[PDB]
Structures are given as structure tokens and as C-alpha cells.
């Protein structure tokens, strides 16, 4: 549709704006609508209440944490929304082979705006751990040893291997320099989630293979 054109436009914006990416007033209005209608018209009243609840929670969070005073409240909402089941419609929205949805793109712009709007003191510096069920070819197409991966996905990780951890077929150990800690905004803060936007670059240093789980363990380092 025109969604294809919107996707490539957004991917171009992501790389051109870099850390200056910022959502516009209407982009936030569109994100609000996308989130409230995401399950269809029958759940709009419930998801309008969820939205209003998240707005008030994030409005008060800015009151309690003045360093967040100039983050759009909707952008913060985007970060809590990311930690719900809604992440499934936006995590891959900018992948080359993904079929974009209007709601996916709306979500994406405000999550990206949030991540580059958070003050640097929210960056986690150190190793963050990720597990996902992905196929070997999926890994090979995206990560090769001693090559740089320009990630087009929203890449989730954790400061820890905590109770949230569960062994998966693919694992990452990613040295973070500016990956942002969003536990303060998540519905489950004790996961200590760290989230990288599309456009993050990783120097892949080595990829381990096992016939056990993890089948593939990727070691990579974020770079400027």
C-alpha cells in the first residue's frame, strides 16, 4: 500500500535523524489512536482506559523525576506499551521483509522518540542479555562475525539473567554503551529491560554454535 512507502520513509528518517529522532504532535495523536484501536472496535473502551491510565502514570513519573520533564508523556507511554503484548506489532515493523501496518509504524515513531529523548543517565553501560527463538538463517542474514550489524529491529535485552530469563535457541551478549534502561517505565520493572532502537549498530565479534540450547550465542558490542 502506501504503508510500504511510509516504512522506507521512516527507515530513512531513523538513519538520517539518528539520536535527534523526535515524534511530532500528530505522530503522538496517531500513536494514541493506533494503541486504542489495536485490538479492534470492541476493545476501544477498555484500551482507552488503559491509555488514560498510562498517561496519568507517566505524567506523575515526570513530576517525581524532573530529568524527564521535557519527554513527551505519550513517548513515555510508548515505552510502557512496549513492555505489554503490543510489542509484537512493532518490533519487526522496519525489517526489510516485514509487512508494515499503520499501527506498527505509529508505535515505532514514539518508541524511537522516547529512547533518544531519555537523558543519558538512563543508559546502561555493560553486557545485556537477550534470548529469542530464531532460525539459523535468520541469524546468518543479520549477524556475521567481525562484521557490523545495523539492527532494524527494536532489540530488547536485560541487565540481568533474572527470574524473567528462560533459555532460548538464540542468545546475545551485547555490550551496551547507550542502550536505555526502561524498567522504571515497564509494567514488570524487575525484568530490568534494556531497549535498543532500530538503527543501532553492533560490532559482532564472535558467534558460538551448540547443538544444545543456545544453538547460537552472539557476542556483539554497540558502537557509535
Author numbering: 73 to 296
Report text from the authors:
XopAI, encoded by XAC3230 in Xac, is a putative type III effector composed of 296 amino acids. XopAI resembles a bent right hand, and it can be dissected as a two-lobe structure with an N-terminal α-helical lobe (residues 74 to 193), and a C-terminal β-sandwich lobe (residues 194 to 296). From analyses of the crystal packing, we found that XopAI uses an altered mART domain to bind its own N-terminal peptide containing a conserved Arg residue.
To study the influence of this N-terminal region on the crystallization of XopAI, we produced an N-terminal-truncated protein, XopAI-ΔN70 (by deleting the first 70 residues) and grew the crystals. The crystals belong to space group P21, and they diffract with a resolution of 2.26 Å. In XopAI-ΔN70 crystals, the asymmetric unit contains four copies of the protein. However, we did not observe a thread-like and tandem protein packing in XopAI-ΔN70 crystals. This result suggests that the intermolecular association of the central cleft and the N-terminal sequence is responsible for the observed tandem packing in the crystals of the full-length XopAI protein. More interestingly, the coordinates of the central cleft in the XopAI-ΔN70 crystals show that these residues still have similar sidechain conformations in the absence of the Arg peptide. The loop structure found in the P41212 peptide-bound state is in a stretched conformation, whereas that in the monomer D of the ΔN70 crystal structure is in a contracted conformation. For example, the central cleft in the P41212 peptide-bound state has a volume of 722 Å3; however, that in the monomer D of the ΔN70 crystal structure has a volume of 159 Å3. When mapping these structures onto the energy landscape, we found that three monomers share a similar PN loop structure near well C, whereas the other one has a distinct loop structure near well E. Unlike apo structures, the peptide-bound structures constitute a discontinuous energy landscape.
